């Protein structure tokens, strides 16, 4: 069959978010609140196109919007964020409940210096609507033509001509 089309290695170069998972988990709710729109544009494009190769640029926007998220933490609130993700980082399951006072200090410093409200219980799991300018994929499965069905039954049912027609039976 045909040749698969891989993008170049230059099309895969982006400035990586080189932080650990406890840094991401400590900043997760404010990341979902602030970096909402390009993340949801990317995931809409990702569930609609069903191809990562059709989703690179929006993905780069995700990797563009995460970094601007962290710099805006790193400029203003590096101390409560560091003290909070260290405590998140201690736990082997990375519990939020072990770290509520560092969470409260990080939320206080962020709400004072940046005005970000942490999302309540239920908010980040909502199904949201996304207004994009890319087109809807008309054939996302790349399906070819389907076979035509067999012709249906039509016409009023007349009796059997001369019955069963079984060898000598007249009905």
């Amino acid at each position: 069959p045909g040749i698969v089309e891989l993008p170049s290695l230059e099309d895969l170069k982006v400035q990586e978010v080189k932080v650990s998972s406890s840094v991401l988990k400590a900043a997760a709710h404010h990341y979902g609140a602030q970096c909402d729109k390009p993340n949801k544009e990317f995931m809409l494009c990702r569930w609609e196109e069903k191809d990562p190769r059709r989703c690179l640029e929006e993905g780069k926007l995700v990797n563009q919007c995460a970094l601007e998220f962290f710099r805006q933490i790193k400029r203003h609130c590096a101390e409560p964020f560091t003290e909070y993700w260290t405590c998140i980082d201690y736990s082997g399951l990375q519990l939020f409940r072990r770290c509520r006072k560092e969470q409260a200090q990080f939320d206080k410093c962020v709400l004072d210096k940046l005005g970000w409200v942490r999302p309540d219980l239920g908010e980040l799991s909502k199904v949201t609507k996304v207004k994009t300018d890319r087109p809807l994929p008309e054939n996302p499965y790349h399906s070819r033509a389907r076979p035509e069905p067999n012709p249906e039954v039509e016409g009023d049912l007349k009796p059997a001509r001369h019955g069963s027609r079984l060898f000598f039976w007249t009905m």
């Binding site: 991401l24 988990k25 993700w85």
Partner: protein, 70 residues
């Protein structure tokens, strides 16, 4: 009297104390002064392997914070 049985109970209790203290201290020694990462589910293992790749030194427990970005 009944406190004559307490040396054997003390020896057996120290021997029961040893494995949990040992695994706690060995987990903190082998994982950067912290608990061992618990990966029961594939998302936790995914984040753990991401940590092992973003640390640069092939160790998930080497944490990287805001200093690793500009």
């Amino acid at each position: 009297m009944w406190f004559e049985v307490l040396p054997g109970i003390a020896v057996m209790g120290v021997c029961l104390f040893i494995p949990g203290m040992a695994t706690a201290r060995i987990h903190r020694f082998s994982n950067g002064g912290r608990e061992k990462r618990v990966a029961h589910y594939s998302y936790q293992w995914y984040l753990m392997e991401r940590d092992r790749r973003v640390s640069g030194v092939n160790r998930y427990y080497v944490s990287k914070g805001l200093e690793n970005i500009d």
